[PDB]
Amino acid sequence: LLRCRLPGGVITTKQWQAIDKFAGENTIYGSIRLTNRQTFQFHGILPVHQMLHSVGLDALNDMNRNVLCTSNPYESQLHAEAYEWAKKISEHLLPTYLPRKFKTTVVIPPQNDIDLHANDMNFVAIAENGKLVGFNLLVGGGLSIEHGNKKTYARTASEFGYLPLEHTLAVAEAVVTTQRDWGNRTDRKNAKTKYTLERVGVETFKAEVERRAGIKFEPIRPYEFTGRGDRIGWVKGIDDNWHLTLFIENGRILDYPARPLKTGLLEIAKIHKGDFRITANQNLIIAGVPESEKAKIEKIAKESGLMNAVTPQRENSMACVSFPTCPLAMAEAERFLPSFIDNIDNLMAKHGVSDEHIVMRVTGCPNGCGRAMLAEVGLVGKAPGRYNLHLGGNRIGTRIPRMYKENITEPEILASLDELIGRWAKEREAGEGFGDFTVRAGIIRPVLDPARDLWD
Ligand code: SRM
Ligand code: SF4
Ligand SMILES: [K+]
């Protein structure tokens, strides 16, 4: 199990060819697994560092995870600057020994594809006239919980304030250091930033950050999110360039009979001008394709099965690795999702909502890697074939879903969703999401202050 440091998920075609080779020749599974933190993993490594180092990649005493960056902004020109900053924060934070692992992101509204509320530190980009002028800082997100332990909880990030671009690194360092200093020294399950904030208070923590950074936060500048999904298919970028985002189920890249996904990506990498971008939804973007090259790229993706059409539901569903490789797995996630979504697709069709989607995620255990604690419908593994069903998040991911039913099986889960999707399809207002509806309709009480009301 090896994972690479790849800020913003940007990887070159040369780097791709190198990782594709190693994956096929030096691992048990032979696959490339795209993660939801915009990087990749090999499974069952049978030397990798030399391979990495040779193509300029470095495999991550360091409590630091991959720094995320919105992959395909509507305003395409903003990506270059934002990415530049994600890369700088990444290198800046690179080795202090943090108690727990620290997760950071750079977000470009109105997209929350990187799922900011699952992270310790977030810089929401504010642009004026096509140029980034600063960041709104949100601190304190985290999703890991422990079954039945009411002292643990998922928490959304808190707004601290706005800072000019020039203060970015000073602020990044200051948040890291006060968490390091104030973080719980006695217990690891309470060492994360979300716990520290609740213990000392946001304002107390905020004041310390200003003190250390040598700045005073300005008031938060307006920002809104409209979604978290990728933009599957072709989208027009800057100049004569186009971006093709490929939906990859579970981000598992392998050649399947009649679906040579892995070889197809290699062929594209051989002729692709620009580079690739691994998304926070475990998908892949063939970035910067000249209009002249569109048909060539599309031909390979099409033939390889990389452009096989799926429902909007499937495009908005996610699961963690879980079995067979995860040592902490309680229930299947990745291997369960495909057939589970097959069933949800039938349910959506039955109720006349085949064109709709519900952000649905399955996580193999409460550690929460699948980000089910930010979904409209989240399934959390409790034991083989059994999950806790959570309802009530929203499409943009700013609300934690409360547990609706505990320790139930797939058949029981489907029966409940059949009933609820049916009600939503008929009783929902115009453009109302499933999560919001369950809260509006009184099907589940919302989680308003996680540290205090997440658990019944
Ligand atoms: C691959 C990935 C899920 C996926 O299907 O994409 C993943 C996979 C695993 N995670 Fe994670 N996590 C992944 C995103 C996350 C997320 C979501 C996110 O960051 O966007 C979370 C929830 C947010 C959070 O941190 O609160 C998450 C919370 C955890 C935890 C709980 C940490 C905690 O604070 O309590 C653990 C266990 C631990 O580290 O103690 C963990 C542990 C693990 C390990 C490395 C298991 C281990 O400790 O040995 C899993 C490897 C499974 C395997 O065989 O590949 N993973 N994990 C993601 C890899 C991200 C990356 O490239 O770094
Ligand atoms: S949520 Fe649990 S089962 Fe899934 S990858 Fe994370 S640690 Fe493993
Ligand atoms: K995916």
Q: What is the CA(359)–ligand 1 centre distance, in A? A: 19
CATH assignment, 1-60+227-310: 3.90.480.10
| Chain CA centroid to CA 378, Å | 14
Q: Is the CB of 326 under 6 A from ligand 1?
A: yes
103 an active-site residue? yes
Contact 399, 393 (CB under 8 A): yes
Test site for ligand 1: of 321, 322, 367, 379, most ligand atoms within 8 A of the Cβ: 367
Q: Which H, E and C letters describe the chain, residue by residue?
A: CEEEECHHHEECHHHHHHHHHHHHHHECCCCEEECCCCCEEECCECCHHHHHHHCCCEECCCCECCCEECCCCCCCCHHHHHHHHHHHHHHHHCCCCCCCCECEEEECCCECCCCHHHCCEEEEEEEECCEEEEEEEEECCECCCCCCCCCCCCECCEEEEEEEHHHHHHHHHHHHHHHHHHCCCCCHHHCCHHHHHHHHCHHHHHHHHHHHHCCCCECCCCCCCCECCCCCEEEECCCCEEEEEECCHHHEECEECCEEHHHHHHHHHHHCCCCEEECCCCCEEEEEEEHHHHHHHHHHHHHCCCCCCCCHHHHCEEECCCCCCCCCCCCCCCCCHHHHHHHHHHHHHHCCCCCCCCCEEEECCCCCCCCHHHCCEEEEEEECCEEEEEECCCCCCCCCCEEEEEEEEHHHHHHHHHHHHHHHHHHCCCCCCHHHHHHHCCCCCCCCCHHHHCCC
Instruction: Say whether domain 61-226 belongs to CATH 3.40.50.1000.
Output: no
Contact 392, 420 (CB under 8 A): no
Pairing state between β 32-34 and 40-42: antiparallel
Contact 38, 22 (CB under 8 A): no
Cβ neighbours of residue 88 under 8 Å, at least 6 residues apart?
Answer: 168, 169
Q: Is the CB of 301 under 6 A from ligand 2?
A: no
Q: Atom 44, ligand 1: which residue's CA is nearest?
A: 326
Is residue 320 part of an annotated ligand binding site?
A: yes
Q: Which two tokens stand for residue 4?
A: 């690479």
Q: Can you give the residue ranges of every domain in the chain?
A: 1-60+227-310, 61-226, 311-453
Q: Is the CB of 250 under 6 A from ligand 2?
A: no
Contact 2, 42 (CB under 8 A): yes
Q: Is the CB of 328 under 6 A from ligand 1?
A: yes
**Sign of the C-alpha dihedral, residues 356, 358, 362, 367?**
positive
Ligand 2 atom with the shortest distance to the CA of 330: 3
Phi, then psi, of 196 in degrees rounded to 5: -60, -45
Do the domains at 61-226 and 311-453 have one common CATH topology? yes
- Angle (CA) 410-315-333 rounded to 5° is 35
257/159 Cα distance (integer angstroms): 49
392/378 Cα distance (integer angstroms): 9
- Angle (CA) 181-185-186 rounded to 5° is 165
Task: Check the chain for breaks (C–N over 2.5 Å) and list the residue before each, or none.
Answer: 46, 60, 95
Q: Atom 22, ligand 1: which residue's CA is nearest?
A: 369
Superfamily for the 311-453 domain: Sulfite Reductase Hemoprotein, domain 1 (3.30.413.10)
Residues, beta carbon < 5 Å, ion ligand 3: 282-283
- Angle (CA) 98-103-107 rounded to 5° is 145
155 an active-site residue? no
Technique of determination:
X-ray
Is residue 69 part of an annotated ligand binding site?
A: no
74/85 Cα distance (integer angstroms): 18
- Bridge partner residues of 277 (DSSP): 10, 285
